[PDB]
Design an enzyme around this catalytic site. Structure first.
Site, PDB file in Angstrom:
ATOM      1  CG  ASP A  97       0.981  11.964  12.833  1.00  0.00           C
ATOM      2  OD1 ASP A  97       1.108  10.732  12.720  1.00  0.00           O
ATOM      3  OD2 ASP A  97       0.019  12.507  13.428  1.00  0.00           O
ATOM      4  CG  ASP A 127      -6.006   6.208  -1.250  1.00  0.00           C
ATOM      5  OD1 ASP A 127      -7.185   6.270  -0.848  1.00  0.00           O
ATOM      6  OD2 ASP A 127      -5.704   5.771  -2.376  1.00  0.00           O
ATOM      7  CE  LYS A 141      -4.237  15.235  14.997  1.00  0.00           C
ATOM      8  NZ  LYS A 141      -3.226  15.967  15.817  1.00  0.00           N
ATOM      9  CD  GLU A 156      -3.053  -0.307  -0.097  1.00  0.00           C
ATOM     10  OE1 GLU A 156      -3.180   0.891  -0.423  1.00  0.00           O
ATOM     11  OE2 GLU A 156      -3.585  -1.235  -0.742  1.00  0.00           O
ATOM     12  CG  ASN A 209       2.997   7.779  17.678  1.00  0.00           C
ATOM     13  OD1 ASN A 209       3.965   7.753  18.442  1.00  0.00           O
ATOM     14  ND2 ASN A 209       1.922   7.026  17.860  1.00  0.00           N
ATOM     15  CG  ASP A 266      -3.181   8.747  14.808  1.00  0.00           C
ATOM     16  OD1 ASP A 266      -3.039   8.470  13.595  1.00  0.00           O
ATOM     17  OD2 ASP A 266      -2.721   9.788  15.350  1.00  0.00           O
ATOM     18  CG  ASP A 267      -1.508   6.133  11.056  1.00  0.00           C
ATOM     19  OD1 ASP A 267      -1.152   6.652  12.126  1.00  0.00           O
ATOM     20  OD2 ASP A 267      -1.339   6.671   9.942  1.00  0.00           O
TER      21      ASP A 267
HETATM   22 CA   LIG Z   1      -0.555   8.913  13.081  1.00  0.00          CA
END
Ligand SMILES: [Ca+2]
EC number: 3.2.1.17
Length: 130
Positions: free
Chosen positions: A86, A54, A83, A36, A88, A91-92
């Site tokens: 970024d 995307d 978000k 991806e 980190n 949160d994905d």
């Molecule tokens: Ca993130």
């Protein structure tokens, strides 16, 4: 400029309880990320098959999964798309878990369908220390 290597992403998702998440192995999740985004946390694609964009390591579309402006959004993950750009990926992952809950499972990611679903991934992470 966070860009992961297979084994690093693996140890990471293996600590977030992804291995077997929704009946999906750890190799599948990684294999998905490799095709991806090529493990790039800042990967972007602005002309998806649809027409939106995307975002991030898992290429989350902005029409269904995150909120923006260019157009409306169900924003089923309730988080801004930026978000996902970024470094980190905490949160994905939470949003990628929501995705697999839908009817089509990990087929939501065309690349996972192209180079992962029909492949034998029993040795895909064999060289990894987890
Ligand atoms: Ca993130």
């Amino acid at each position: 400029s966070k860009i992961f290597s297979k084994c690093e992403l693996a140890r990471k998702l293996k600590s977030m309880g992804m291995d077997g998440f929704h009946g999906y192995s750890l190799a599948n999740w990684v294999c998905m990320a490799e095709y991806e985004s090529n493990f790039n946390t800042q990967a972007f694609n602005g002309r998806n098959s649809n027409g939106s964009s995307d975002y991030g390591i898992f290429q989350l579309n902005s029409k269904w999964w995150c909120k923006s402006n260019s157009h409306s959004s169900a924003n089923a993950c309730n988080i801004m798309c930026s978000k996902f750009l970024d470094d980190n990926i905490d949160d994905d992952i939470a949003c990628a878990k929501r995705v697999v809950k839908d009817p089509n499972g990990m087929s939501a990611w065309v690349a996972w369908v192209k180079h992962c679903k029909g492949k034998d991934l029993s040795k895909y992470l064999a060289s990894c220390n987890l």
